[PDB]
Every structure is written in C-alpha cells, then in structure tokens.
Amino acid sequence: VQLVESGGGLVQPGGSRKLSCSASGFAFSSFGMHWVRQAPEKGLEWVAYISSGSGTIYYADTVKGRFTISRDDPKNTLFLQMTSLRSEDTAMYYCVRSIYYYGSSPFDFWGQGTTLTVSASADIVMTQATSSVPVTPGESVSISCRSSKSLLHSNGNTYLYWFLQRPGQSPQLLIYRMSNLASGVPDRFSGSGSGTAFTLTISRLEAEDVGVYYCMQHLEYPLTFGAGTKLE
Amino acid sequence: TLSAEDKAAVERSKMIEKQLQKDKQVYRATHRLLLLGADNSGKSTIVKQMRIYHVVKTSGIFETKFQVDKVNFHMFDVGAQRDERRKWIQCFNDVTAIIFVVDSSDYNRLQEALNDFKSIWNNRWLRTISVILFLNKQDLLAEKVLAGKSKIEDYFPEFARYTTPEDATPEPGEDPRVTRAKYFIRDEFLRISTASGDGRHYCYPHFTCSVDTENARRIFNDCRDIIQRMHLRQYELL
Amino acid sequence: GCHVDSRVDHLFPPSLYIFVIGVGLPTNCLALWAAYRQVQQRNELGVYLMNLSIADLLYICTLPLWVDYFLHHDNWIHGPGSCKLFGFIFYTNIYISIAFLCCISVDRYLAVAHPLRFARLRRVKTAVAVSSVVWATELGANSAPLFHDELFRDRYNHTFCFEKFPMGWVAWMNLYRVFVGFLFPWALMLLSYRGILRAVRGSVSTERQEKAKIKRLALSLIAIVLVCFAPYHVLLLSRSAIYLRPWDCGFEERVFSAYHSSLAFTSLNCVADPILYCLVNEGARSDVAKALHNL
Amino acid sequence: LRQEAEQLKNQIRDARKACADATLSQITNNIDPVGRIQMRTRRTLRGHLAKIYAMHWGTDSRLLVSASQDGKLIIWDSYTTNKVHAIPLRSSWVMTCAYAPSGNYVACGGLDNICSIYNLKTREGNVRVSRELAGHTGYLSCCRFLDDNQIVTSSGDTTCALWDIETGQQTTTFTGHTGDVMSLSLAPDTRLFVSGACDASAKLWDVREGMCRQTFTGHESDINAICFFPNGNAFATGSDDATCRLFDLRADQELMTYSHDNIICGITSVSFSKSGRLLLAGYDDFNCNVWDALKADRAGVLAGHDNRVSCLGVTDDGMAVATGSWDSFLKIWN
Amino acid sequence: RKLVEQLKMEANIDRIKVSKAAADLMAYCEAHAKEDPLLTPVPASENPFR
C-alpha cells in the first residue's frame, strides 16, 4: 500500500492551490481520508477528513471555510481545495488513510507529504510532558500525555492514538485506541492509561526508535494532537 | 450519543446496505432453474446448445446464464454429486422451476425415469415448485417406432388398450404410431403429475429434440405462467 | 335562496351511519392489521391497503358529528373550525379511497398481466412514493372549500356545513369531482380488471373454477364501487348541470332527498372495502383469526 | 467372513448392554428443573436477500458471520447491528460458514465442492479469497477451523477431510461413513471431532491418526446437526425422525432422548449452552426449542421465525443465542 | 475385510459405568451454574443487548 501526494510549492499570500494525493495498492473507495499538516518546526494539526461515500466532511476551525476536501474514487485521487492562503498555511501536508468498523485500525498509513511554503473554544487540549527525553539505548521510557476531557466513552473505548515520527519520513502508527499495537509494530511498545493521563512505554529501545512521539484523540472533532516528545 | 468512530461504523453499515439493495434488485430480476436428468437423458446437449446460441475437475454445480426477451435466467445442473439427492435438493425450494429432461427412446430405463419423476414431484420441499419436463430425443423415438425392431407394449403392457387422445397435435405430419407412443409416454408422466398435485404446482410437458432452438422460449413461456400463478396468489386474487 | 325540506332525511342517514360505525370500525381496523402483516412480508400491495383503511378510518371518525348534524334537521351547533376540518375529511375521504382502489387495481394488473417485468414499480418504496403522491394530490386538489366561506347558516331552522342551497365555483368543483375523481379512477379499475381477466384466460395452471372465481370477484369490485358512488355523482352532476339560464332555484323536491340519501348510501363503501379486500381472502382471514386467538 | 462381522457387532452390543446400569433420568430425578425460560428477541439482523443456512459466532462473542443462498457472507456487529463486512461468494449455493478462532479468516462451502477461505485482515481494506480447497467429490456440508492453518471439511461424499491451508492438500482423509455427512463438531481441545451422516450414525475421529475411534447408532433416520457438550466427553445430535439424542464418548451409549408427540418435524441445528444445562434445537415447525439436558423436558420455545430455523449458535460466554431462518433474518436472543 | 479390523479396533476399548457418566455431566452442569447467562438472567446492566 502507498499514498503519494504532490501539488505543492512556493505560493504567494492570498493565492490558491489544489493539493492532490494519489493512492495505490489498496481499496481506496472503502477508506476515509484525512489531511494532516505540521508547521515547519511544530507538531501535527488536523486539516480535514472526508468519509467513504463522501457523506461526511469535516474541517478544522482554523480553515473552516477557505479549505475544501474532495475525492475521485474511480480515478483514485484525494484533493484539497485551498483558497486565500494566509501565513499559518506554511506546512507539510500529510495524506492519511482511515477505515472504521469494529476492531478497525484508523490512521495506519501516512503519505510522504507535500511541502507548501507561503512567503511573507470547546475543543480538547492534549499536553505532552517536557519535549525532550534523552535516554541511552537499551533502557525503558514512559512518554506521557494529558487530556482535558476523559477520552473514555460509554462504549468502553478510549480514543488515544500514538504516532512515531522518525527524523526523516512520515509518521507511523504505533498504538490505536490506547492499547492496540498496529500491524508491524514490535512487541516492545505498550500503551496504558486511565482516561485522562496516558503513558506509552518502550520496553528496550533501539537506535531506530528515535524520533518525536505524538498523541491524538479521536473522541470528538476536531482531532487535536499535542506538541510531541523528542527522544535522543 | 455515540462517538466519532461509531458514527463512521454506522456509515459503513449504511453503505453496505446500499450495495445490498442493488444486489436485491439484480437478484429479483433473475429467475433460477434446476436442470435434472439421467446420463442417457440429453441434458448436456441442451445446456451446451443454450450456452451456444444464447449468451475445475470435481466441481459440483454448473452455472448457465441465458436471456430470453430481456429476461434473465440462471440454470443449474449438478455435476459431481452422488446418486443420493434428498439433502441438496432442499436448496432448490425457491427456484422458479425444475426442468426434468428424459430420454424418451430408451423404453427400458424409462420406468426408472418415472420413479425419479415421482421422487421429484412428491418431495416435501419441492411442493409449490413446478416442473417443465422435456421429453427429449423425439427423433430417436420416431425412428425406433418406424423401424419396428424394438416394441413398446412389451415393456409397458397397458400400451395395447391405450388410445391416442383427441387433443393430440402432431403438426408436421407424422405416422400415427409415433404420435401414439409419445403421447403414451407423456400420459404416464402426466398421470404421476396429476395424482397428488393439490393444485399448488403444475407440470408442463414439452416434446423436445436436443438440437431444437426453441427450448429457451419454452422455458420462458412456462416460467411466465408460473410467475403469473404466484402473483395471482400473492395479490389476493385466489 | 330557496328552502327545502328533509322529511325522512333526518332518519335514514343517521340510522345508516350508526350501522356504518358499528360495523366498519372493527372491520377497517382488522383490514389495517392485515395490511400491516402484508407489508411485513415485502408485499407491495399492503401499503395501499393500510392507506385504504386509514382513508376509511378517519372517515368513520368524522361521522358522529354529522350524525348530530343530521338528526337535528341539518343544524350545526359545534363551531366553524369543526365544520371546516370535519366536512373536509368527510367529503374528501371517499375520493382518497377511490384513488387507492385504482392504485391497487393497477398493481394487480402489473403483477398478473405483465409479470417478469416492471419489477421496480412493484416495490415497497415505490408504493410508499405513490401513496404520498396520491395523498398530496387528493388533499390539495379538493382543498378549494378550505379557502372559502365555512358554513352558510340560515333561518329556516337550518345551520349548514360544507353545502349551501342553492349553489359560482362549487359548480366547477363538482364537475372536477365527478369527472376526475369518479370516472377516471373507475375507468382505470375496469380496464385493469379486464386486462387481468384477459391474462388469466391463458393460465394453464389455473383450473376453470378459479377463473370463474376471479371473474366474479373482479365484477363484484367494480359493481360495488359503482353502486356505492354512482347515485351521489349522478345527483351532483344533475344539480351542477343547472346552475351553469335562469337562476331558477326550484329543486326543493330533489335537494335534501337526493343529496342526503345519496351521501348516506355512499358511505357504505367504507364497510365494503374491508370485506372485499381482506375478509374474502383466505390468508387475510387466517391472519385475523391469529389476531383474535390472542384476545 | 460376514459372520465374523455380525458376531463382532453382537459382541459390541453386548458390551454396551453390560456397561449400562442406570439411566440419566433416574439419576437426575433429584435435581430441580430450570423451570420456564423466557428468552426475548433483542436484535434483528436484516440484510440477507435469500434464506440463511449457516452462522458461526466469533470467539470475541460480538462478531458473527452468516451465509445466504444469494451468495453473500455478512459479518455483523451484534451489539450495534452494523455490517462490518459483506463477502460476495463465487458460488451462490453456500451451506456452511466458519469464523476462524483468531478472527482472521472465514470459510464457506457448498454445492461447488470447494471450501473457500477468506482473509479478513489485509493491508488493503477488502476481504479476498485466500485459497480454494479442492478434492471432495460431493457437496461440503460443514467446515470448522482448528487454527489459522488447518480446517476440517465434511462432504456429501462420505469423506471428512483435514486440510493444510498453507499448501492445500488433504493431510488426513477420514472415511468409514456410508451416507452423506451433514454436521461436524470439533472437541473443545481440538484433537477429536464428531461427524453425523445419512446412515443414521455418528463417529468420533482422531485427527492425528485418522481412524474412526467410535461409532454411534441410535437414530431412525438421517442426522442433521451435531454438537459437543462443553465438557468434551458427550455430544448431542439432531435427526429428521423428530428426535435429539445425547451420546457419551466414554460410556459409548445413548443417555437421553429429547422427543415429544406433538413435534413431528426434523431438527436442523443443535447447540448447547455454556454449562450444558440447556440444549437448543432448531426445527422445521418455524420455531426453536430449548431443552433441559438433564431432565429431558421442553424448557422453552424461541418462536419468532416465519420459516424453518436453519442455523443456531450460542456464543462463547453464553450471553446470547443467534438463530437464522429461511426468512432471511437472524435474531439475537438473550 | 478392513471393516472387520475397524470394528474390532473400535470394540477393544474401556467403558466406564453409565452412572458415572451421568454424575460427571451433572457435575459439569452444577459447576458452571452461575456463569450461564441463559439459565440465570444477568441483571440488565452487564448484558450488551439491553
């Protein structure tokens, strides 16, 4: 499976662009797709989400009207209509794949990313611990998160997601719905918490376990992320 | 009320329901048929010819699609089953019709064909399932009666006192003896059909040759009658 | 205008509506129940049947007040809004019923005469769509009196409702009534049942007795509709065939007698439908017997 | 030489007669009945275009696969009535479905003579045919998973077979029946399994060896369903002679017969409860019956189906029983 | 021939008393009396079918 996305570059303020995400290697029509951006040196932010069947389209409040999301399931491409590009719109935009059913694993695959540079209330806040944890290889670490509202639901599901971002490529999913290891994640990773305070533990680190650890809530829209924690 | 994720899950269920409605529309417009017959019975020729002019080693059921006057038909002939039938025949209690093809030129295996027909007709699950019986190989029967080497009264004693029914319709002009023989065979099968019908299902006789091109139209007309009877029952008309 | 009298029309309509209530209430309820069972079995017909029962049931609920309106020598003492709503239901439910019988007959034609075809039209969803359309069209086409004078109260011991003697616009309303609420649906019913019988003729599977039975049933349906609704429209077109040379308002001999006796005789279709569409069929009686086993 | 077989059969009958001292009725007589059991419809799962033959729960007790003759496998979320998956089958005439214990696979089979195994957890979002098992010369009447890699199939040809899903060859072919095998229930430990055929007989098989360990004959007609008592030393059957029967592997006899004069239809599905105190049977008289296994009295009736119950299943933790009928509906009873 | 060998192999086995079989089945039944939701209706706050 792969998600290749393109259509970005230097754009003047007040202009418009159409970001496109070409998908291949999976059944596009049955997946919901998200656009996630992150500022040049900051954490990830959710831009939009389009559902399978296009019957549900959500946007962030910061881009509530300027941005428009669309998909072409036959031609297998995801589009983002951006208008009136202000200066908070300088970011790398990510294409994410999400499918929803009992036992599903949302946000499992993340596209490479498009860089787009522009020249010169009642939302859930997620706060990380100190964004620096220098740890020697072979030890154990306990990155932590805090949520304003209890992510536990009457269903019995707590909607906390853990992502890892190498210094290089796009983020990859590690823990979904607070305790479930994604397809391909080593058994070292383990997640736990109590509804508001969360902890992700890596049992015995390796040299490839370095990066920035982001959390995410899926309890209610919009999807807020958190600052992220760096490991060195 | 329910989380982001459940809502999405519900959406999935609704999309699945939409595809199922489409499948329901296609399923309702397609009429299903079961093809039955013996080894000497020429059902292989009928299925091959219907596949030709219209529209994997131990496989058990063969699917044969065909279309007559913009109406879709699915015809199934079982390939790799044993002699026993009383189990897998229960699956076909919702077919439009059962096409029973019989070799009318045997005279010796034809009592076994009568027994098979009485087994099909009186099945507890095949009630309300009509039977289009194809009295196949009429040309062989005609040539066999003309030749005179093999008799028919010898295997069926009652043939002597049988007289040709007045509603007989030998169209092209054929010897009276072949008409008498074929209507005797038809009358034996129809006697089995009429003995215990109770009116919930009918038997539609047809005289067939395996090469004839009219078999699809025969099935279409009989199926039209069957569906007409069911819809009469459904719309509180009888 | 000109005063007319109802010497026995204070007697026959009330004593007839009391039988209509006391019989057509439970029978139409049972027809509704059987229709619902049919709808539970993916049947495109019951959705019409339900509506028919409803088209009748509301009608029954209107009747008591008109009973009090009748036995009092045509004197309404229950208010104008009651006049508007209740007279509207009373005068419109019969046309709604006729339209639903037409729809049932067309469904039967499409099921019998042209089987193997028009599968989309024989769905529950299409029948709900056409049911909504007929309710909208009937309730909107007959809503002319809802935008006119409510009750034409008078001095000769008569306080009226949805009728004024004599008479304008009610004449053309009456012509539309007769021509596009009786003759057209009846023409469709008769033609559809003729088509059904023409198809049944060629049924090999149907023995001779069942064809005769179907013919008797179809003729009974057409005849009972015609007998219940024909005097009303004959006298209505006769009265509307005058008002459209001289004012000549002199029909006292044929105003209350004709009209009131005929509406009383028209109400009997509200008790005909449950019998003819539920209680004559064996399966519907089986469903009703299952219901009455419980209670 | 046939006289030797007759003498050996007489010897087996005599040994069974000698080993019998008391019946289950006498011994259970001093135990109270469950009384009247009222189970109600909690959820109705609509969506099948044709009649339902098979249904298998998931080991997670929430998911549920069903098979319909329209050619569709549907996975249900029993708690919410949602449709997780809809698998279009290559052959419409399915008569068996299984749900893998791991939850990764579902199997199906029917008049095609193939057991098709489906992959529910793929990198792509769809469910695909993992591979097709061929080799039976008759319709496949039941299929049960031992693990992700082994499946047991029963066929109209007398053979029951054991397959390796990796490279699909009949590793062990179990033979010895004379009629069409209809039902197939694995032991709770997955070392033995029972097969009910049309010779009115049932056999316990040893999977590792491939030999008919025991053979039970007590029925007057063909056997339609079979299931293990949770303990693993007893099993129950259903036959078209309107009776159920409970056999004990160690005692090698029949313990108690579940029959009534009023009922004259055949049993189409048999499933025990978690503790075995309730034996649930599906019938052709439009309805499902709940039996007290120890006292052999009709404890309850599950009657909400307008056609015959073709499938019946009780979840691993016993919260619900599912039943699907020829009316294209599943009902989740509690 | 093979039928005789199969029947002989099936016969030469050990059978316990049937009263012991009945006792074992009742023992299993009474052991899991509480964890059987259909026998003992759980209160309507643990069932997901409320």
Side-chain angles (χ1 to χ4, degrees), chain A residues 1-40 43-44 46-60 62-63 65-74 76-87 89-129 131 133-135 137-138 140-141 143-145 147-173 175-180 182 184 186 189-202 205 207 209-229 231, chain B residues 1-13 15-17 19-38 40-44 46-49 51-52 54-56 58-69 71-82 85-107 110-111 113-123 125-126 128-148 150 152 154-157 159-160 162-165 168-170 172-173 175-197 199 201-221 223-238, chain C residues 1-3 5 10 13-14 16-24 26-39 41 43 45-55 57-60 62 64-67 69-73 76 78-81 83 86-92 94-119 121-124 126-136 139-146 148 151 158-161 163 166-200 202-234 236-237 239 241 246 250-251 254 256 258-281 283-286 289 291-295, chain D residues 5 11 15-16 18-29 31 33-35 37-39 41-127 129-139 141-165 168-190 192-203 205-207 210 212-219 221-266 268-286 288-305 307-334, chain E residues 7 11 13 15-16 18-19 21-29 31-33 36-45 47-49:
Chain A
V1 311
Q2 87 174 327
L3 280 157
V4 181
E5 54 181 354
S6 66
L10 284 89
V11 186
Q12 310 317 116
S16 86
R17 270 265 194 194
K18 190 183 105 199
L19 280 185
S20 295
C21 173
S22 181
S24 60
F26 63 110
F28 186 85
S29 170
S30 56
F31 282 107
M33 311 275 278
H34 304 256
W35 282 100
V36 171
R37 70 175 148 162
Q38 58 162 23
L44 316 159
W46 175 67
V47 176
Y49 153 71
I50 181 164
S51 73
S52 60
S54 310
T56 293
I57 290 192
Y58 281 117
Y59 298 100
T62 64
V63 296
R66 304 191 290 124
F67 284 13
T68 290
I69 190 167
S70 57
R71 63 190 317 174
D72 194 357
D73 306 321
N76 214 317
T77 300
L78 181 78
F79 305 105
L80 177 73
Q81 284 285 148
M82 288 166 316
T83 60
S84 162
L85 282 164
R86 68 182 65 252
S87 175
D89 295 25
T90 68
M92 205 173 218
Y93 292 77
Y94 291 116
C95 194
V96 186
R97 171 261 294 270
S98 75
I99 210 168
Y100 300 98
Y101 50 85
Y102 177 74
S104 174
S105 82
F107 289 78
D108 61 357
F109 204 79
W110 288 60
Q112 273 316 117
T114 67
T115 187
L116 188 149
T117 81
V118 170
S119 303
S121 63
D123 67 89
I124 310 176
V125 298
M126 306 270 285
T127 63
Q128 293 295 109
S131 296
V133 185
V135 287
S140 174
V141 305
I143 299 94
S144 66
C145 165
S147 70
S148 72
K149 179 189 323 181
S150 180
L151 294 185
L152 182 62
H153 202 275
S154 60
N155 294 318
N157 289 337
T158 301
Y159 299 94
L160 176 84
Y161 287 64
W162 280 112
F163 300 88
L164 183 83
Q165 189 170 33
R166 273 89 160 89
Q169 63 273 31
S170 64
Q172 52 183 250
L173 179 72
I175 298 289
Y176 69 86
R177 271 176 325 256
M178 183 178 176
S179 68
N180 316 311
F189 303 88
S190 179
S192 66
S194 67
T196 288
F198 314 104
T199 292
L200 162 68
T201 180
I202 299 104
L205 282 72
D209 294 17
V210 298
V212 176
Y213 286 74
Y214 297 96
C215 57
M216 203 206 65
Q217 70 94 30
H218 215 290
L219 188 64
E220 69 186 17
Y221 290 92
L223 308 168
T224 58
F225 264 97
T229 298
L231 261 53
Chain B
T1 46
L2 59 88
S3 66
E5 280 183 17
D6 333 332
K7 280 194 173 65
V10 155
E11 230 191 310
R12 207 159 127 105
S13 195
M15 270 208 70
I16 287 172
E17 292 175 29
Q19 174 88 237
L20 294 161
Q21 287 182 357
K22 282 186 193 179
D23 284 11
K24 188 191 274 190
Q25 304 313 140
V26 176
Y27 167 102
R28 263 161 90 92
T30 302
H31 306 288
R32 276 161 297 285
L33 303 171
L34 173 68
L35 201 76
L36 283 173
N40 53 5
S41 171
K43 41 155 175 179
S44 297
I46 297 169
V47 65
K48 281 156 200 173
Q49 180 64 254
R51 196 182 298 143
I52 283 161
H54 307 80
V55 175
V56 176
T58 58
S59 66
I61 198 165
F62 301 137
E63 173 89 39
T64 301
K65 277 74 69 177
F66 71 95
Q67 183 163 109
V68 176
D69 291 331
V71 176
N72 273 337
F73 292 94
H74 273 208
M75 182 179 72
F76 305 85
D77 71 292
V78 298
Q81 315 299 336
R82 305 183 331 112
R85 212 151 53 192
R86 67 176 176 269
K87 299 295 187 291
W88 61 260
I89 193 66
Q90 313 191 6
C91 309
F92 303 98
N93 72 305
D94 54 42
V95 298
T96 300
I98 290 181
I99 306 150
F100 193 91
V101 176
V102 72
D103 190 317
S104 300
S105 66
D106 286 333
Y107 287 149
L110 189 151
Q111 192 65 49
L114 286 201
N115 296 342
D116 290 331
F117 180 79
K118 182 174 72 68
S119 179
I120 300 299
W121 192 256
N122 291 287
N123 214 305
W125 308 104
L126 298 190
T128 69
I129 301 299
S130 306
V131 173
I132 316 169
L133 61 83
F134 275 1
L135 294 147
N136 212 30
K137 314 163 181 253
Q138 280 305 323
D139 54 4
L140 287 163
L141 175 80
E143 290 177 9
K144 175 170 281 213
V145 176
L146 291 194
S150 44
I152 173 169
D154 48 353
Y155 292 161
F156 292 89
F159 178 75
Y162 181 82
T163 186
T164 314
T169 315
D175 186 74
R177 282 129 60 207
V178 55
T179 296
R180 192 150 157 271
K182 67 185 218 178
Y183 278 80
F184 169 69
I185 308 284
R186 201 216 58 176
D187 279 22
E188 291 292 328
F189 279 96
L190 277 180
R191 175 202 328 285
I192 299 182
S193 66
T194 300
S196 66
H201 66 287
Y202 195 69
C203 187
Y204 304 83
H206 289 294
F207 300 112
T208 59
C209 277
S210 313
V211 176
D212 291 331
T213 187
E214 295 292 328
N215 292 321
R217 185 142 301 279
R218 300 176 192 270
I219 301 180
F220 167 71
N221 291 323
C223 285
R224 203 171 159 299
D225 206 311
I226 300 156
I227 306 300
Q228 194 183 83
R229 190 96 165 91
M230 313 193 213
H231 285 170
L232 273 170
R233 185 91 40 82
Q234 181 181 334
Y235 283 51
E236 316 187 20
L237 271 174
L238 62 86
Chain C
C2 193
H3 59 55
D5 186 75
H10 89 274
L16 191 145
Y17 287 141
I18 62 170
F19 154 84
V20 165
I21 293 175
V23 178
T27 57
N28 264 282
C29 283
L30 294 152
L32 168 69
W33 166 239
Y36 170 69
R37 291 288 319 170
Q38 289 285 285
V39 174
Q41 284 153 350
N43 202 349
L45 185 87
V47 285
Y48 303 109
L49 298 175
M50 292 180 183
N51 289 339
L52 198 46
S53 177
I54 304 151
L57 279 167
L58 299 185
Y59 180 91
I60 289 299
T62 296
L65 283 200
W66 288 111
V67 164
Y69 172 93
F70 269 119
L71 61 83
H72 282 101
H73 289 282
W76 188 285
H78 292 59
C83 184
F86 279 43
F88 179 50
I89 297 169
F90 178 68
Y91 285 71
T92 301
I94 72 170
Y95 292 94
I96 285 147
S97 296
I98 297 169
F100 278 126
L101 280 72
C102 172
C103 280
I104 278 164
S105 179
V106 181
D107 210 0
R108 282 161 171 203
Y109 178 76
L110 286 178
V112 182
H114 293 297
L116 291 77
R117 281 178 205 291
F118 317 126
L121 281 73
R122 274 200 327 260
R123 288 186 60 186
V124 294
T126 287
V128 172
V130 306
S131 292
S132 287
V133 168
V134 54
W135 274 100
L139 280 195
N142 301 116
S143 66
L146 265 294
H148 274 89
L151 61 84
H158 300 160
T159 54
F160 264 60
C161 183
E163 94 196 46
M167 201 95 68
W169 73 262
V170 71
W172 283 340
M173 183 76 184
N174 296 351
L175 261 53
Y176 174 93
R177 284 186 203 261
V178 46
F179 263 61
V180 178
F182 193 45
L183 276 296
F184 196 46
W186 195 71
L188 277 296
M189 293 177 70
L190 186 88
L191 265 183
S192 66
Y193 284 119
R194 184 161 150 300
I196 290 171
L197 295 161
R198 191 153 320 250
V200 166
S203 193
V204 194
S205 66
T206 292
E207 59 177 352
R208 184 168 43 87
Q209 323 307 313
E210 307 197 1
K211 291 179 194 95
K213 200 170 297 186
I214 292 166
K215 162 175 254 203
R216 300 200 279 93
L217 173 67
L219 295 196
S220 66
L221 262 55
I222 316 166
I224 191 166
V225 160
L226 183 63
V227 63
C228 291
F229 293 101
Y232 172 41
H233 285 57
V234 161
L236 182 43
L237 183 63
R239 197 188 182 88
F251 292 124
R254 72 140 168 162
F256 292 101
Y259 268 47
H260 297 263
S261 294
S262 190
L263 276 296
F265 183 60
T266 291
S267 66
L268 282 72
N269 164 269
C270 180
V271 75
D273 303 353
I275 278 179
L276 269 295
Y277 286 53
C278 184
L279 282 169
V280 298
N281 186 254
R285 288 207 325 264
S286 179
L292 277 296
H293 265 70
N294 282 359
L295 312 182
Chain D
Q11 185 250 327
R16 271 161 163 165
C19 293
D21 57 354
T23 64
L24 181 59
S25 302
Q26 274 144 25
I27 291 176
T28 43
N29 200 1
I31 297 89
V34 303
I37 299 300
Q38 297 83 239
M39 306 212 296
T41 191
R42 289 307 193 229
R43 273 130 191 82
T44 299
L45 313 178
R46 290 170 260 254
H48 276 300
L49 321 182
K51 53 183 173 173
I52 295 142
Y53 291 173
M55 156 271 297
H56 201 202
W57 276 103
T59 300
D60 69 291
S61 303
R62 202 181 146 154
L63 284 188
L64 183 63
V65 67
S66 72
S68 175
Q69 299 273 264
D70 62 49
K72 197 70 62 68
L73 287 174
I74 301 188
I75 287 170
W76 306 90
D77 183 22
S78 166
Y79 290 11
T80 72
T81 66
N82 296 115
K83 294 180 177 67
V84 185
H85 282 117
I87 297 94
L89 308 184
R90 280 165 188 162
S91 184
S92 63
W93 300 107
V94 61
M95 32 185 78
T96 185
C97 77
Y99 184 77
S102 75
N104 286 80
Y105 307 93
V106 287
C108 67
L111 288 163
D112 62 358
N113 296 352
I114 297 89
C115 189
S116 308
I117 298 157
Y118 294 88
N119 192 356
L120 293 181
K121 306 262 177 38
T122 63
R123 300 268 274 122
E124 317 87 0
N126 44 27
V127 176
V129 176
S130 183
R131 63 164 51 66
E132 301 171 308
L133 309 171
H136 275 303
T137 61
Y139 55 106
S141 65
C142 196
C143 58
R144 249 42 169 181
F145 274 101
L146 306 195
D147 49 324
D148 273 324
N149 198 55
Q150 313 194 290
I151 191 167
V152 180
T153 67
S154 54
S155 182
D157 61 81
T158 72
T159 294
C160 295
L162 172 72
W163 311 75
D164 188 34
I165 300 175
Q169 318 318 120
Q170 315 189 10
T171 78
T172 300
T173 291
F174 306 83
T175 59
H177 270 299
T178 300
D180 295 14
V181 180
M182 291 295 127
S183 179
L184 187 64
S185 198
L186 316 166
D189 51 281
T190 303
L192 307 171
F193 68 88
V194 289
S195 66
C198 284
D199 52 3
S201 83
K203 300 183 178 299
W205 308 87
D206 186 62
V207 182
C212 169
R213 193 140 298 285
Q214 298 178 359
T215 300
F216 308 89
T217 55
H219 276 296
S221 189
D222 62 358
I223 297 169
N224 281 107
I226 211 167
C227 72
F228 265 100
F229 200 84
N231 188 204
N233 55 2
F235 69 94
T237 73
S239 177
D240 266 350
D241 59 0
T243 71
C244 288
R245 281 185 168 68
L246 183 68
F247 303 89
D248 208 302
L249 260 54
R250 280 167 325 170
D252 206 47
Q253 303 187 19
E254 175 185 357
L255 294 176
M256 187 66 204
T257 309
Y258 309 86
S259 70
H260 205 288
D261 270 7
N262 169 315
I263 310 150
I264 60 171
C265 47
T268 66
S269 302
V270 170
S271 198
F272 269 114
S273 176
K274 205 185 183 324
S275 45
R277 187 55 191 285
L278 291 201
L279 185 149
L280 287 84
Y283 277 106
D284 303 358
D285 55 14
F286 295 98
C288 178
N289 279 320
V290 180
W291 302 79
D292 188 66
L294 299 181
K295 300 191 75 63
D297 313 308
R298 272 161 40 61
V301 176
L302 288 159
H305 275 295
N307 224 317
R308 61 164 257 174
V309 162
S310 47
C311 64
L312 186 72
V314 179
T315 187
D316 273 335
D317 61 305
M319 294 299 291
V321 57
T323 187
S325 178
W326 282 10
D327 64 350
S328 87
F329 300 123
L330 281 77
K331 278 177 172 38
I332 310 294
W333 305 79
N334 199 329
Chain E
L7 211 59
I13 66 161
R15 294 99 182 264
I16 75 164
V18 177
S19 76
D24 290 1
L25 292 176
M26 294 182 287
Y28 196 99
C29 281
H32 307 253
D36 198 350
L38 303 185
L39 294 174
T40 77
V42 61
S45 67
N47 62 322
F49 307 97

